[PDB]
Amino acid sequence: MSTIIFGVVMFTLIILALVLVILFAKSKLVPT
């Protein structure tokens, strides 16, 4: 089940990376 575990990890990491990039960008650009 290496493919399943690799699929689960990569799917989560790809989304987490995308979310973190947007959150970091929003905090450093959008004025408050």
Distance CA 25, CA 20 (A): 8
| Distance in Å, CB of 19 to other proteins, minimum | 6
Tell me the two tokens of residue 31: 């004025």
26 near other proteins, judged by CB under 8 A: yes
24 near other proteins, judged by CB under 8 A: no
Residue type, 17: A
Number of chain positions touching other proteins (CB under 8 A): 21
The residues binding other proteins (CB under 8 A) are 1-4, 6-8, 10-12, 14-16, 18-19, 21-23, 25-26, 29
